[PDB]
Enzyme design. Structure first.
Site, short mmCIF file in Angstrom:
data_model
loop_
_atom_site.label_atom_id
_atom_site.label_comp_id
_atom_site.label_asym_id
_atom_site.label_seq_id
_atom_site.Cartn_x
_atom_site.Cartn_y
_atom_site.Cartn_z
N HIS A 39 0.80 -1.22 0.00
CA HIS A 39 0.00 0.00 0.00
C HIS A 39 0.84 1.28 0.00
CE1 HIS A 39 0.43 -0.50 4.46
NE2 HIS A 39 0.63 0.81 4.37
N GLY A 141 3.18 5.58 10.67
CA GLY A 141 4.47 5.44 10.04
C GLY A 141 5.22 4.18 10.39
N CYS A 143 4.24 1.00 9.55
CA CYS A 143 4.09 -0.09 8.58
C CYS A 143 5.43 -0.44 7.95
CB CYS A 143 3.10 0.28 7.48
SG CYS A 143 1.38 0.16 8.00
#
Ligand SMILES: *[C@@](O)(CO)[C@H](C[C@@H]1CCNC1=O)NC(=O)[C@H](CC(C)C)NC(=O)c1cc2c(OC)cccc2[nH]1
Ligand SMILES: *[C@@](O)(CO)[C@H](C[C@@H]1CCNC1=O)NC(=O)[C@H](CC(C)C)NC(=O)c1cc2c(OC)cccc2[nH]1
Lengths: 299, 298
Positions: A39, A141, A143
């Site tokens: 993503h 932040g 991920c």
């Protein structure tokens, strides 16, 4: 008895940041590939209902900003494997450790290296719950942060972070991009299945108590595995698998208490309670220490 | 909300093994000096009551075997600073981070990198308790493991491991070799002073529980600072200072619960118990998170 992470240095040397447009997260740089959540290619609006194969056709190598610190690594290839993106870069990471990609089972523990903008922030131990969530500590932040175990200098990567559920637990994939559990990388409110107590780890905890001389709960009974599993499910405990019985083998040998004898002791605990007594000082039974963790710390 | 350690890579690159005769432990290799507990020079007999200056003068540079993974580091000089031995080596550690030696105060937390035979084994958070012990996880061979904090790539070393008390808690020195607490590096059973609970940390943790959506312990009451401290001292909690109240400011502002309102909540918990319930998964009042730990993590 406390939760101990593995030393994180071998993973710290592999953390990079990956930016597409304004969207930034963390990636894992091993040899000449960077692995990160797919993503990253989505705009905030795209994440609501993304078509990843269509979003990816619009991207080229030169749309990807991969940075070790502030040093850019040029992307020379890209592909999508499930929910992870694999960016081939022009530089092989000199800090790459011996490594493997492994998919762990519920109950297994691992160390998480929480990262932000490619920079490691902290490290802590997590257990995969039987509903395939972890009780992590992640902010915006995070991920692309990874989970791992280290066996004789070989890093087995087992988790990459994607999602925080509304309940506050966390969900993610293995390093091949396959989610643990029934979650999807969309900006959508998803619910986990009912959790269960991790039986094999409670049994490990009971062995740890016995090793330390705390053994009042040992009884004169035994059980069959099927009989135990059917009772355990009535107390929201996981049924045991054959693999669970076998990973309790070393602790069973060390203490001389048969696995099914310990199951009979736990069954009595579940049906009758602690009766105000404690085990390893605690009135609660601990379910996030694996048999491996118990021996890792006890001996 | 989890007990979270600093990434240990900068410290891992400095752990070595130090051996004198039959005795082995861990050392910290910074620039061209290896720091390690001085009792490495003791045999089993010596450790019962060691005269360390007398034992050290009888040692030569060659009596010290220092191994960094596989490489052997040649010791070219040695001195003793309190309980810490400083071995000068002919090679500077190229992986030396920006670092400082600090002595921490009770209540402050730090990360421990537990090591055996100079090889890092695990990392976890500890707090320096009011009686100057820490609740660690250390086995045979762990001496010389270090505790540290990390602030913008600078490692502040604050603890070197020396001993496990009969109660199972742990004791050690700063990197100047001065023990935390009334302990000594002799092979004897030593008791600590009474273990007062770190009140400001329990309050910080209650704020962490509210920030993470748990409020069951809050109440409509308030308390004065002195009335709270009277109850705190009765339950062997540390008295709360106005500096503590100030340090809790950000968590109070973020949360909208006045510090003295949270004190009234803690007073209730101390007087009523938790009545079987749990906070952030714990059946006990957690005292090993500082206000900074909560802010940084949240
Ligand atoms: C990664 O940092 C994102 O690249 C981020 C990590 C979480 C932020 C807070 N803590 C975390 O662990 N991930 C997300 O923001 C993901 C992105 C998806 C996979 C595209 N989304 C969520 O975690 C998310 C979305 C929603 C939601 O919607 C509406 C409603 C409720 C919860 C929720 N979580
Ligand atoms: C070191 O690694 C020594 O190099 C060791 C670490 C402990 C062993 C088990 N867990 C640990 O944390 N430290 C010691 O063995 C020290 C050595 C001293 C400082 C010379 N000794 C003790 O921790 C110790 C001695 C005694 C004791 O005596 C008699 C009686 C009771 C407890 C006790 N602890």
């Amino acid at each position: 008895f406390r939760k101990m992470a593995f030393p994180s240095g071998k993973v710290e040397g592999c953390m990079v940041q990956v930016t597409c447009g304004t969207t930034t997260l963390n990636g894992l740089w091993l040899d000449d590939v960077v692995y990160c959540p797919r993503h990253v290619i989505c705009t905030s609006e795209d994440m609501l209902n993304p078509n990843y194969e269509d979003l990816l056709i619009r991207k080229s190598n030169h749309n990807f900003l991969v940075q070790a610190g502030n040093v850019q690594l040029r992307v020379i290839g890209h592909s999508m494997q499930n929910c992870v993106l694999k960016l081939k870069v022009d530089t092989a990471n000199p800090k790459t450790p011996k490594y493997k990609f492994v998919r762990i089972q519920p109950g297994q523990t691992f160390s998480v290296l929480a990262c932000y903008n490619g920079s490691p922030s902290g490290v802590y131990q997590c257990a995969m719950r039987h509903n395939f969530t972890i009780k992590g500590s992640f902010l915006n932040g995070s991920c692309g942060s990874v989970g791992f175990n280290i066996d004789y200098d070989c890093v087995s990567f087992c988790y990459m972070h994607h999602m925080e559920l509304p309940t506050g637990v966390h969900a993610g994939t293995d390093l091949e991009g396959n989610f643990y559990g029934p979650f999807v990388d969309r900006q959508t409110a998803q619910a986990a299945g009912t959790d269960t107590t991790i039986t094999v780890n409670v049994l490990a905890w009971l062995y740890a108590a016995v090793i330390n001389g705390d053994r009042w709960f040992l009884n004169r009974f035994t059980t069959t595995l099927n009989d135990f599993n059917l009772v355990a499910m009535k107390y929201n405990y996981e049924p045991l698998t054959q693999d669970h019985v076998d990973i309790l083998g070393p602790l069973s040998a060390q203490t001389g208490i048969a696995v099914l004898d310990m199951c009979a002791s736990l069954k009595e605990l579940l049906q009758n309670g602690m009766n105000g007594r404690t085990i390893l000082g605690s009135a609660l039974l601990e379910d996030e220490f694996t048999p491996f963790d118990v021996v890792r710390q006890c001996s």
